[PDB]
Design an enzyme around this catalytic site. Structure first.
Site, PDB file in Angstrom:
ATOM      1  N   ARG A  14      13.715  43.382  31.801  1.00 58.18           N
ATOM      2  CA  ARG A  14      14.590  43.015  31.162  1.00 58.18           C
ATOM      3  C   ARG A  14      15.224  44.083  30.185  1.00 58.18           C
ATOM      4  O   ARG A  14      16.424  44.700  31.013  1.00 58.18           O
ATOM      5  CB  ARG A  14      14.875  41.762  30.775  1.00 58.18           C
ATOM      6  CG  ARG A  14      16.302  40.914  30.795  1.00 58.18           C
ATOM      7  CD  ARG A  14      17.057  40.045  29.524  1.00 58.18           C
ATOM      8  NE  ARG A  14      17.455  39.227  30.100  1.00 58.18           N
ATOM      9  CZ  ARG A  14      18.399  37.771  30.391  1.00 58.18           C
ATOM     10  NH1 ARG A  14      16.973  36.932  30.587  1.00 58.18           N
ATOM     11  NH2 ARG A  14      19.112  38.318  31.006  1.00 58.18           N
ATOM     12  N   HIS A  16      21.095  34.198  33.340  1.00 55.05           N
ATOM     13  CA  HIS A  16      20.878  33.191  31.849  1.00 55.05           C
ATOM     14  C   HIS A  16      20.310  34.192  31.176  1.00 55.05           C
ATOM     15  O   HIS A  16      18.712  34.501  31.713  1.00 55.05           O
ATOM     16  CB  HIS A  16      19.929  32.081  32.879  1.00 55.05           C
ATOM     17  CG  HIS A  16      21.129  31.070  31.590  1.00 55.05           C
ATOM     18  ND1 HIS A  16      20.015  31.197  30.430  1.00 55.05           N
ATOM     19  CD2 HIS A  16      21.414  30.304  31.496  1.00 55.05           C
ATOM     20  CE1 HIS A  16      19.732  29.777  29.998  1.00 55.05           C
ATOM     21  NE2 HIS A  16      21.136  29.666  30.112  1.00 55.05           N
ATOM     22  N   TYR A  17      20.000  34.076  30.372  1.00 49.97           N
ATOM     23  CA  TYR A  17      19.410  34.557  28.756  1.00 49.97           C
ATOM     24  C   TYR A  17      18.714  34.231  28.752  1.00 49.97           C
ATOM     25  O   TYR A  17      17.751  35.118  28.309  1.00 49.97           O
ATOM     26  CB  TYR A  17      20.654  34.304  27.897  1.00 49.97           C
ATOM     27  CG  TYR A  17      20.410  32.652  26.706  1.00 49.97           C
ATOM     28  CD1 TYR A  17      19.123  33.022  25.647  1.00 49.97           C
ATOM     29  CD2 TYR A  17      21.199  31.953  27.198  1.00 49.97           C
ATOM     30  CE1 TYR A  17      19.400  31.711  25.182  1.00 49.97           C
ATOM     31  CE2 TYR A  17      21.313  30.733  26.523  1.00 49.97           C
ATOM     32  CZ  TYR A  17      19.880  30.626  25.308  1.00 49.97           C
ATOM     33  OH  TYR A  17      19.900  29.485  24.379  1.00 49.97           O
ATOM     34  N   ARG A  18      17.877  33.186  29.186  1.00 53.64           N
ATOM     35  CA  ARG A  18      16.119  32.701  28.834  1.00 53.64           C
ATOM     36  C   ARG A  18      15.454  33.127  29.668  1.00 53.64           C
ATOM     37  O   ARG A  18      15.802  34.219  30.709  1.00 53.64           O
ATOM     38  CB  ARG A  18      16.497  30.904  28.945  1.00 53.64           C
ATOM     39  CG  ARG A  18      16.524  30.477  27.855  1.00 53.64           C
ATOM     40  CD  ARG A  18      16.606  29.051  28.440  1.00 53.64           C
ATOM     41  NE  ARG A  18      17.084  27.991  26.310  1.00 53.64           N
ATOM     42  CZ  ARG A  18      17.307  27.045  26.642  1.00 53.64           C
ATOM     43  NH1 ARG A  18      17.890  25.828  27.662  1.00 53.64           N
ATOM     44  NH2 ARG A  18      17.719  27.037  25.066  1.00 53.64           N
ATOM     45  N   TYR A  19      14.126  33.292  29.574  1.00 53.96           N
ATOM     46  CA  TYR A  19      13.275  34.102  30.228  1.00 53.96           C
ATOM     47  C   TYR A  19      11.737  32.978  30.902  1.00 53.96           C
ATOM     48  O   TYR A  19      11.315  31.741  29.948  1.00 53.96           O
ATOM     49  CB  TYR A  19      12.494  35.091  29.301  1.00 53.96           C
ATOM     50  CG  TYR A  19      12.874  36.056  28.598  1.00 53.96           C
ATOM     51  CD1 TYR A  19      13.963  36.081  28.217  1.00 53.96           C
ATOM     52  CD2 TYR A  19      12.256  37.074  28.566  1.00 53.96           C
ATOM     53  CE1 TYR A  19      14.995  37.433  28.059  1.00 53.96           C
ATOM     54  CE2 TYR A  19      13.817  38.872  28.122  1.00 53.96           C
ATOM     55  CZ  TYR A  19      14.440  38.664  27.516  1.00 53.96           C
ATOM     56  OH  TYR A  19      15.246  39.965  27.439  1.00 53.96           O
TER      57      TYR A  19
END
Ligand code: NA
Length: 181
Positions: A113, A128-131
């Site tokens: 990222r 989306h911001y999550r991993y």
């Protein structure tokens, strides 16, 4: 066809090094699974052209790894730039997952990222911001019941598509081996 905001975008990058400010992306691949990890479609597998001066930044580990895999020769032969790789990948992803819905999925995906933020921000924006980092589960298993890890093996070829396929297989193994849901 199976377009859904629950689908997961898996991605792997190969680079000339570890530092986004210095190094460059030389391969990208993506896979879409559904929420249950069934592989729905494989995206473009793209060796990204880089000039010799950028390849000349590679240390011994990257040089030998990416030469022996055939990636360096594909990079030299490639006529596809980062922007074209972005365009190809987004045209793929828009058919399977809506924008901004899927976390970024892979192994140690935070490192990829960083390279997306620096070199492909239009593509980073799609996630989306999550991993969803499969190595998070690997690390917890190593500490809580390491014997489990002897039942799974990785080839680790550093060909982007094969490496993502191994990441999905690794999470599939964990769901049966360390999860109860
Ligand atoms: Na990787």
């Amino acid at each position: 066809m199976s377009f859904s905001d629950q689908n997961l975008i898996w991605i792997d990058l190969e680079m000339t090094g570890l530092d986004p400010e210095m190094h460059k992306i030389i391969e990208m691949a993506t896979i879409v699974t559904d929420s249950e990890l069934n592989i729905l479609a494989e995206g473009p597998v793209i060796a990204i052209h880089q000039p010799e001066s950028e390849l000349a930044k590679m240390d011994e580990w990257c040089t030998t790894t990416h030469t022996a895999s055939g990636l360096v020769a594909r990079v030299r032969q490639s006529q596809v730039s980062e922007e074209e790789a972005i365009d190809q990948t987004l045209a793929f992803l828009k058919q399977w997952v809506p924008e901004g819905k899927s976390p970024i999925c892979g192994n140690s995906i935070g490192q990829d990222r960083r390279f997306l933020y620096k070199h492909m921000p239009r593509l980073e924006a799609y996630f989306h911001y999550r991993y969803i980092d499969v190595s998070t589960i690997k690390e917890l298993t190593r500490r809580w019941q390491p014997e489990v890890l002897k039942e799974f093996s990785k080839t680790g070829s550093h060909l982007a598509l094969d490496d993502i396929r191994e990441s999905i297989a690794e999470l599939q193994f964990y769901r049966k081996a360390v999860f109860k849901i």
